[model samples]
Target: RPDFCLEPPYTGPCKARIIRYFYNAKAGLVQTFVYGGCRAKRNNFKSAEDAMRTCGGA
Candidate 1:
Protein backbone atom coordinates (compact mmCIF):
# COMPACT_ATOMS: atom_id res chain seq x y z
CA ARG A 1 0.00 0.00 0.00
CA PRO A 2 1.29 3.42 -0.95
CA ASP A 3 0.87 6.74 0.84
CA PHE A 4 -1.74 7.69 -1.72
CA CYS A 5 -3.77 4.56 -1.02
CA LEU A 6 -7.20 4.36 0.62
CA GLU A 7 -5.59 3.88 4.00
CA PRO A 8 -3.22 6.54 5.22
CA PRO A 9 0.34 5.85 6.39
CA TYR A 10 0.07 2.64 4.37
CA THR A 11 2.49 1.58 1.70
CA GLY A 12 3.16 -1.35 -0.65
CA PRO A 13 0.49 -3.44 -2.41
CA CYS A 14 -1.80 -0.40 -2.47
CA LYS A 15 -4.41 -0.60 0.29
CA ALA A 16 -7.00 1.50 -1.44
CA ARG A 17 -10.07 -0.22 -0.11
CA ILE A 18 -13.52 0.55 -1.37
CA ILE A 19 -15.01 2.39 1.59
CA ARG A 20 -18.46 2.69 -0.01
CA TYR A 21 -19.98 1.07 -3.09
CA PHE A 22 -23.59 1.17 -4.24
CA TYR A 23 -25.72 0.42 -7.27
CA ASN A 24 -28.44 2.98 -8.03
CA ALA A 25 -31.56 1.28 -9.32
CA LYS A 26 -32.91 4.48 -10.78
CA ALA A 27 -29.70 5.56 -12.47
CA GLY A 28 -28.51 1.98 -13.04
CA LEU A 29 -24.92 2.82 -12.20
CA VAL A 30 -22.48 1.44 -9.72
CA GLN A 31 -20.86 4.10 -7.56
CA THR A 32 -17.73 3.69 -5.52
CA PHE A 33 -16.63 5.75 -2.54
CA VAL A 34 -13.12 5.86 -1.12
CA TYR A 35 -11.78 7.25 2.09
CA GLY A 36 -8.49 7.84 3.98
CA GLY A 37 -5.10 8.89 2.59
CA CYS A 38 -4.28 12.46 1.64
CA ARG A 39 -4.91 11.76 -2.02
CA ALA A 40 -6.86 14.09 -4.27
CA LYS A 41 -10.34 13.51 -5.70
CA ARG A 42 -9.05 13.46 -9.25
CA ASN A 43 -9.21 9.69 -9.43
CA ASN A 44 -11.68 7.01 -10.44
CA PHE A 45 -12.08 3.55 -12.02
CA LYS A 46 -12.87 2.87 -15.67
CA SER A 47 -16.01 0.70 -15.19
CA ALA A 48 -17.97 -0.99 -12.41
CA GLU A 49 -16.51 -4.37 -13.31
CA ASP A 50 -13.03 -2.89 -13.32
CA ALA A 51 -13.70 -1.24 -9.97
CA MET A 52 -14.72 -4.49 -8.30
CA ARG A 53 -12.41 -6.82 -10.21
CA THR A 54 -9.15 -4.90 -10.00
CA CYS A 55 -9.67 -2.67 -6.96
CA GLY A 56 -6.76 -3.72 -4.75
CA GLY A 57 -4.81 -5.17 -7.66
CA ALA A 58 -3.73 -8.67 -6.83
Candidate 2:
Protein backbone atom coordinates (compact mmCIF):
# COMPACT_ATOMS: atom_id res chain seq x y z
CA ARG A 1 0.00 0.00 0.00
CA PRO A 2 1.07 3.54 -0.69
CA ASP A 3 2.10 5.60 2.33
CA PHE A 4 -0.41 8.23 1.39
CA CYS A 5 -3.23 5.68 1.48
CA LEU A 6 -2.59 5.22 5.18
CA GLU A 7 -2.80 8.91 5.97
CA PRO A 8 -5.90 10.19 7.68
CA PRO A 9 -8.20 12.68 5.96
CA TYR A 10 -7.24 16.33 6.51
CA THR A 11 -9.67 19.10 5.91
CA GLY A 12 -7.20 21.78 6.98
CA PRO A 13 -8.05 24.84 9.08
CA CYS A 14 -9.16 27.06 6.24
CA LYS A 15 -12.81 27.87 5.60
CA ALA A 16 -13.17 26.77 1.98
CA ARG A 17 -15.47 23.82 1.42
CA ILE A 18 -14.11 22.15 -1.67
CA ILE A 19 -15.35 18.67 -2.38
CA ARG A 20 -12.60 16.07 -2.19
CA TYR A 21 -11.94 12.35 -1.95
CA PHE A 22 -9.58 10.47 0.34
CA TYR A 23 -8.42 6.91 0.83
CA ASN A 24 -9.77 5.54 4.08
CA ALA A 25 -7.44 2.77 5.11
CA LYS A 26 -9.66 1.71 8.02
CA ALA A 27 -12.59 1.15 5.68
CA GLY A 28 -10.43 -0.01 2.77
CA LEU A 29 -12.14 2.37 0.39
CA VAL A 30 -12.12 5.84 -1.09
CA GLN A 31 -14.49 8.19 0.66
CA THR A 32 -15.73 11.73 0.06
CA PHE A 33 -15.30 14.73 2.34
CA VAL A 34 -15.07 18.50 2.36
CA TYR A 35 -11.66 20.02 1.81
CA GLY A 36 -10.38 23.38 2.99
CA GLY A 37 -8.41 23.92 -0.24
CA CYS A 38 -5.16 24.49 1.61
CA ARG A 39 -2.52 22.39 3.33
CA ALA A 40 -3.85 19.33 1.58
CA LYS A 41 -2.06 16.05 2.11
CA ARG A 42 -1.19 13.24 -0.32
CA ASN A 43 -4.29 11.33 0.72
CA ASN A 44 -6.50 14.01 -0.79
CA PHE A 45 -7.80 13.58 -4.35
CA LYS A 46 -9.75 15.71 -6.77
CA SER A 47 -12.16 12.89 -7.45
CA ALA A 48 -13.12 9.46 -6.17
CA GLU A 49 -11.90 7.80 -9.36
CA ASP A 50 -8.50 9.41 -8.96
CA ALA A 51 -8.33 8.34 -5.33
CA MET A 52 -9.24 4.79 -6.29
CA ARG A 53 -6.64 4.76 -9.06
CA THR A 54 -3.97 5.89 -6.64
CA CYS A 55 -4.89 3.93 -3.52
CA GLY A 56 -7.55 1.30 -4.18
CA GLY A 57 -5.29 -1.77 -4.09
CA ALA A 58 -3.45 -3.44 -1.24
Candidate 3:
Protein backbone atom coordinates (compact mmCIF):
# COMPACT_ATOMS: atom_id res chain seq x y z
CA ARG A 1 0.00 0.00 0.00
CA PRO A 2 1.21 3.47 -0.97
CA ASP A 3 -0.14 4.58 2.36
CA PHE A 4 2.66 2.66 4.07
CA CYS A 5 6.37 2.07 3.56
CA LEU A 6 7.08 -1.64 3.65
CA GLU A 7 9.91 -2.80 5.86
CA PRO A 8 12.87 -4.37 4.04
CA PRO A 9 14.20 -6.82 6.60
CA TYR A 10 14.41 -10.55 7.09
CA THR A 11 11.14 -12.14 8.12
CA GLY A 12 10.28 -15.32 10.03
CA PRO A 13 12.98 -16.41 12.53
CA CYS A 14 16.63 -15.29 12.80
CA LYS A 15 17.70 -11.70 13.45
CA ALA A 16 14.60 -10.60 11.64
CA ARG A 17 13.24 -7.10 11.78
CA ILE A 18 9.95 -5.98 13.20
CA ILE A 19 8.08 -4.46 10.31
CA ARG A 20 5.48 -2.09 11.59
CA TYR A 21 4.10 1.40 11.06
CA PHE A 22 4.35 4.44 13.22
CA TYR A 23 2.70 7.84 13.15
CA ASN A 24 5.22 10.63 13.07
CA ALA A 25 3.72 13.74 14.53
CA LYS A 26 6.78 15.93 13.93
CA ALA A 27 6.85 14.88 10.30
CA GLY A 28 3.02 14.88 10.24
CA LEU A 29 3.14 11.52 8.53
CA VAL A 30 2.81 7.81 9.12
CA GLN A 31 5.95 5.91 8.34
CA THR A 32 7.27 2.44 8.98
CA PHE A 33 9.43 1.97 12.04
CA VAL A 34 11.43 -1.23 12.27
CA TYR A 35 13.36 -2.65 15.20
CA GLY A 36 16.15 -3.33 12.71
CA GLY A 37 18.60 -6.25 13.03
CA CYS A 38 16.27 -7.84 15.56
CA ARG A 39 13.05 -9.76 15.83
CA ALA A 40 9.69 -8.44 17.01
CA LYS A 41 5.95 -9.05 16.97
CA ARG A 42 3.89 -9.86 13.88
CA ASN A 43 4.16 -7.85 10.67
CA ASN A 44 2.27 -7.05 7.45
CA PHE A 45 -1.10 -5.67 8.49
CA LYS A 46 -3.59 -4.99 5.69
CA SER A 47 -5.68 -2.24 7.14
CA ALA A 48 -5.83 1.45 7.95
CA GLU A 49 -7.49 0.63 11.25
CA ASP A 50 -4.33 0.79 13.34
CA ALA A 51 -2.93 3.66 11.30
CA MET A 52 -5.93 5.93 11.49
CA ARG A 53 -6.85 4.80 14.94
CA THR A 54 -3.35 5.83 16.07
CA CYS A 55 -3.26 9.48 14.91
CA GLY A 56 -7.03 9.76 14.65
CA GLY A 57 -6.52 10.17 10.92
CA ALA A 58 -4.85 13.47 11.49
Candidate 4:
Protein backbone atom coordinates (compact mmCIF):
# COMPACT_ATOMS: atom_id res chain seq x y z
CA ARG A 1 0.00 0.00 0.00
CA PRO A 2 1.09 3.57 -0.52
CA ASP A 3 2.03 5.54 2.59
CA PHE A 4 1.35 9.23 2.95
CA CYS A 5 3.78 11.38 4.91
CA LEU A 6 2.21 13.27 7.71
CA GLU A 7 2.79 17.00 8.17
CA PRO A 8 4.80 18.54 11.05
CA PRO A 9 4.07 16.40 14.09
CA TYR A 10 2.86 13.61 11.84
CA THR A 11 6.24 13.40 10.07
CA GLY A 12 8.71 15.11 12.40
CA PRO A 13 10.70 13.04 14.89
CA CYS A 14 9.33 13.80 18.32
CA LYS A 15 6.91 12.58 20.96
CA ALA A 16 4.52 12.35 18.04
CA ARG A 17 6.16 9.06 17.07
CA ILE A 18 2.99 7.45 18.22
CA ILE A 19 1.12 9.36 15.58
CA ARG A 20 2.96 7.50 12.86
CA TYR A 21 3.10 4.06 14.44
CA PHE A 22 -0.40 4.45 15.72
CA TYR A 23 -1.44 4.15 12.11
CA ASN A 24 -0.27 1.28 9.94
CA ALA A 25 -0.32 3.60 6.96
CA LYS A 26 3.10 2.15 6.18
CA ALA A 27 1.72 -1.35 5.77
CA GLY A 28 -1.88 -0.30 5.40
CA LEU A 29 -3.71 0.79 8.54
CA VAL A 30 -5.44 -2.00 10.41
CA GLN A 31 -8.99 -2.65 9.15
CA THR A 32 -8.49 0.58 7.27
CA PHE A 33 -6.04 0.47 4.38
CA VAL A 34 -5.43 -2.76 2.54
CA TYR A 35 -2.24 -1.79 0.70
CA GLY A 36 -2.29 0.90 -1.98
CA GLY A 37 -4.51 3.40 -0.18
CA CYS A 38 -3.68 6.75 1.46
CA ARG A 39 -4.62 8.65 4.59
CA ALA A 40 -6.35 11.22 2.42
CA LYS A 41 -9.08 8.56 2.43
CA ARG A 42 -8.27 6.68 5.57
CA ASN A 43 -11.36 7.34 7.70
CA ASN A 44 -13.49 7.02 4.59
CA PHE A 45 -14.30 4.41 2.02
CA LYS A 46 -12.33 4.89 -1.16
CA SER A 47 -14.50 2.85 -3.48
CA ALA A 48 -18.23 3.22 -4.09
CA GLU A 49 -20.83 2.01 -6.59
CA ASP A 50 -23.17 4.45 -8.25
CA ALA A 51 -26.94 3.93 -8.24
CA MET A 52 -27.03 3.82 -12.02
CA ARG A 53 -26.49 0.38 -13.46
CA THR A 54 -26.89 -1.37 -16.79
CA CYS A 55 -28.40 -4.76 -17.50
CA GLY A 56 -25.61 -7.30 -17.15
CA GLY A 57 -22.57 -5.26 -18.05
CA ALA A 58 -24.32 -3.38 -20.83
Candidate 5:
Protein backbone atom coordinates (compact mmCIF):
# COMPACT_ATOMS: atom_id res chain seq x y z
CA ARG A 1 0.00 0.00 0.00
CA PRO A 2 1.06 3.55 -0.65
CA ASP A 3 1.90 5.92 2.19
CA PHE A 4 -1.11 8.05 1.34
CA CYS A 5 -3.40 5.14 2.12
CA LEU A 6 -2.22 5.30 5.73
CA GLU A 7 -2.66 9.05 6.08
CA PRO A 8 -5.75 10.48 7.68
CA PRO A 9 -8.47 12.08 5.57
CA TYR A 10 -7.82 15.78 5.21
CA THR A 11 -10.48 18.25 4.13
CA GLY A 12 -7.87 20.88 3.54
CA PRO A 13 -8.36 24.60 4.24
CA CYS A 14 -10.10 25.73 1.06
CA LYS A 15 -13.70 26.92 0.75
CA ALA A 16 -14.84 24.53 -1.97
CA ARG A 17 -16.72 21.61 -0.50
CA ILE A 18 -16.81 18.41 -2.56
CA ILE A 19 -17.40 14.70 -2.07
CA ARG A 20 -14.21 12.69 -1.96
CA TYR A 21 -12.95 9.25 -1.02
CA PHE A 22 -10.00 7.96 0.97
CA TYR A 23 -8.55 4.64 1.90
CA ASN A 24 -8.61 3.90 5.61
CA ALA A 25 -5.96 1.27 6.10
CA LYS A 26 -6.87 0.62 9.71
CA ALA A 27 -10.51 0.04 8.80
CA GLY A 28 -9.53 -1.82 5.63
CA LEU A 29 -12.08 0.05 3.54
CA VAL A 30 -12.61 2.95 1.25
CA GLN A 31 -14.62 5.63 2.99
CA THR A 32 -16.22 8.85 1.88
CA PHE A 33 -15.26 12.29 3.09
CA VAL A 34 -15.54 15.97 2.29
CA TYR A 35 -12.85 17.76 0.37
CA GLY A 36 -12.00 21.47 0.32
CA GLY A 37 -10.76 21.45 -3.32
CA CYS A 38 -7.36 23.08 -2.87
CA ARG A 39 -4.32 21.87 -1.04
CA ALA A 40 -5.56 18.31 -1.14
CA LYS A 41 -3.12 15.46 -0.59
CA ARG A 42 -2.67 12.36 -2.73
CA ASN A 43 -5.08 10.49 -0.48
CA ASN A 44 -8.05 12.32 -2.04
CA PHE A 45 -10.00 10.52 -4.78
CA LYS A 46 -12.96 11.44 -6.96
CA SER A 47 -14.55 8.04 -6.50
CA ALA A 48 -14.46 5.10 -4.14
CA GLU A 49 -13.49 2.79 -7.01
CA ASP A 50 -10.39 4.86 -7.65
CA ALA A 51 -9.41 4.72 -4.02
CA MET A 52 -9.97 0.99 -3.96
CA ARG A 53 -7.96 0.49 -7.10
CA THR A 54 -5.05 2.35 -5.61
CA CYS A 55 -5.16 1.05 -2.07
CA GLY A 56 -7.83 -1.50 -1.38
CA GLY A 57 -6.07 -4.82 -0.54
CA ALA A 58 -2.79 -6.64 -1.01
Candidate 6:
Protein backbone atom coordinates (compact mmCIF):
# COMPACT_ATOMS: atom_id res chain seq x y z
CA ARG A 1 0.00 0.00 0.00
CA PRO A 2 0.98 3.63 -0.16
CA ASP A 3 2.87 5.29 2.67
CA PHE A 4 0.06 7.83 2.92
CA CYS A 5 -2.73 8.88 0.62
CA LEU A 6 -2.88 12.05 -1.47
CA GLU A 7 -4.28 13.90 1.60
CA PRO A 8 -7.53 15.81 2.13
CA PRO A 9 -10.03 16.54 0.95
CA TYR A 10 -9.27 12.85 1.26
CA THR A 11 -12.89 11.71 0.79
CA GLY A 12 -11.66 8.24 1.41
CA PRO A 13 -11.87 5.48 3.95
CA CYS A 14 -9.37 7.63 5.87
CA LYS A 15 -12.16 9.34 7.82
CA ALA A 16 -13.93 6.10 8.59
CA ARG A 17 -10.73 4.30 9.47
CA ILE A 18 -9.66 7.18 11.66
CA ILE A 19 -12.92 6.96 13.54
CA ARG A 20 -12.44 3.23 13.79
CA TYR A 21 -8.84 3.65 14.95
CA PHE A 22 -9.92 6.10 17.63
CA TYR A 23 -12.13 3.32 18.92
CA ASN A 24 -9.62 0.54 18.28
CA ALA A 25 -5.85 0.82 17.85
CA LYS A 26 -5.54 -2.33 15.77
CA ALA A 27 -8.39 -1.36 13.53
CA GLY A 28 -6.43 -1.97 10.30
CA LEU A 29 -5.60 1.59 9.30
CA VAL A 30 -2.29 0.28 7.98
CA GLN A 31 -3.87 -1.57 5.08
CA THR A 32 -7.60 -0.92 5.09
CA PHE A 33 -7.27 1.86 2.56
CA VAL A 34 -4.59 0.36 0.42
CA TYR A 35 -6.31 1.25 -2.85
CA GLY A 36 -7.45 4.78 -2.19
CA GLY A 37 -6.23 6.01 -5.52
CA CYS A 38 -9.10 8.23 -6.60
CA ARG A 39 -11.33 9.34 -3.79
CA ALA A 40 -11.75 13.03 -4.52
CA LYS A 41 -13.15 12.89 -8.02
CA ARG A 42 -16.76 13.97 -8.33
CA ASN A 43 -19.17 11.44 -9.75
CA ASN A 44 -22.93 10.95 -9.83
CA PHE A 45 -23.68 8.24 -7.37
CA LYS A 46 -26.69 10.29 -6.31
CA SER A 47 -27.03 9.11 -2.70
CA ALA A 48 -25.63 6.71 -0.11
CA GLU A 49 -27.62 3.83 -1.51
CA ASP A 50 -26.47 4.63 -4.99
CA ALA A 51 -22.91 4.71 -3.78
CA MET A 52 -23.31 1.52 -1.79
CA ARG A 53 -24.97 -0.33 -4.61
CA THR A 54 -22.78 0.88 -7.44
CA CYS A 55 -19.63 1.96 -5.67
CA GLY A 56 -18.02 -0.24 -3.12
CA GLY A 57 -17.65 1.08 0.42
CA ALA A 58 -14.41 0.61 2.25
Best by TM-score: 5
Residue-wise C-alpha lDDT for candidate 2, range 1-58, written one tens digit per residue: 6897998899998999999999898998889989987898999999899999999876
Off by over 4 Å in 1: 1-43, 56-58
Clash count for candidate 1 is: 4
- By TM-score, the candidates rank as 5, 2, 3, 1, 6, 4
For each of the candidates, give the backbone clash count.
4, 0, 0, 2, 0, 0
Q: What is the per-residue lDDT of model 4 for residues 32-52, given as tens digits with 9 covering 90 to 100? A: 223222323322232322101
What TM-score against the true fold does each predicted structure earn? 0.25, 0.89, 0.42, 0.15, 0.91, 0.22
lDDT scores for all predictions? 0.40, 0.90, 0.46, 0.24, 0.90, 0.28
After the best TM-score superposition of candidate 1, give how far the Cα of residue 55 lies from its true spot, in angstroms: 1.7
The residue-by-residue lDDT of candidate 6 on 1-58, one tens digit each, is 2222222223354333321111111333222222233354332233434423332323
Q: What are the per-residue Cα lDDT tens digits for candidate 1 across 1-58?
A: 1222242222224456645443333343446655343443422444566444433343
Q: Predicted candidate 3: what Cα RMSD to the true structure?
A: 8.5
Candidate 2: give its CA RMSD in angstroms: 1.1
Give, for candidate 3, the lowest lDDT window spanning 10 residues: 1-10
Stretches of candidate 5 exceeding 4 Å from the true structure: none
Candidate 1 residue pairs in backbone clash: 1-11, 1-12, 1-13, 1-14
Cα lDDT tens digits, model 5, 1-58, are 7887899999999988799999988898899999988899898999999999999756
For model 1, what is the C-alpha lDDT against the true structure? Answer: 0.40
In model 3, what are the clashing residue pairs, if there are any? none
Per-residue C-alpha lDDT of model 3 across residues 1-58, encoded as one tens digit per residue: 3333233322345554555565554565555655454444333332435754645442
